[PDB]
């Protein structure tokens, strides 16, 4: 099974998942001087109910906060999107070093880490699964994390990480104010792309927030203490879980701001 180790890592994903070599793969390098300001883009409009979060788990590839996507309590609207996209899940990417952890890279700069908020198009598709397979199916909001002062909005998550050391472990997790974790400014870049983990489906409209949020070194280190292995299996740590940037192949990266 795929992972981020020598033998199963990004460079090998294409053996098992051919679309790894597609023309709309993510993440990318965002070169700010080449991005175009699009006055036709709309402001992001976000409503995230703290009662939506239910469960935190170790997938073996990140932690995953799972949200009740039965109805439309928690949604993303606006930006480049047509209609309403329903909140499904949150996870984080990091690397083994604090200066090289994000998936998206801005003018050569890699952040300490990158939070992904995953949503699906409930206005057009009946379920996350059906949406995941369409070009306008999914929308992922990306937030960069930079090293600095500890972030009290991450305490809720970090406090759970011991209980989910092993791959597969899960713990109830509710009253999670995801809105308060986002940066104060919602200016963004957007481009059409893919999942950054197998199955690597090209169904994602990426919305990458310009403004990072803080994390301490000590907070980030706690994530690398998660295992990519299950109970009663040789232990290996998830020290790194980001995919290298992929070729743009002529796609247009747009900015909500000038
Ligand atoms: C290391 O990162 C992850 O663990 C991770 C998990 C889920 C997802 S999205 C849902 C994947 C999925 C699986 C099966 C079917 C349809 C969608 C992503 S991402 N970076 O937004 O592309 C990362
Ligand atoms: Zn992700």
Curated annotation (Swiss-Prot):
The lineage of its organism: Eukaryota, Metazoa, Chordata, Craniata, Vertebrata. Substrate binds at residues 196-197. The keyword Lyase applies. This is Carbonic anhydrase 13. GO terms for molecular function: carbonate dehydratase activity; zinc ion binding. Inhibited by acetazolamide. Transmembrane segments: none annotated. The gene is CA13. The keyword Zinc applies. Reversible hydration of carbon dioxide. It catalyses: hydrogencarbonate + H(+) = CO2 + H2O. Its EC number is 4.2.1.1. Belongs to the alpha-carbonic anhydrase family. The active site is at 61 (proton donor/acceptor). Keywords: Lyase, Metal-binding, Zinc. Its cofactor is Zn(2+). GO terms for cellular component: cytoplasm; cytosol; intracellular membrane-bounded organelle; myelin sheath.
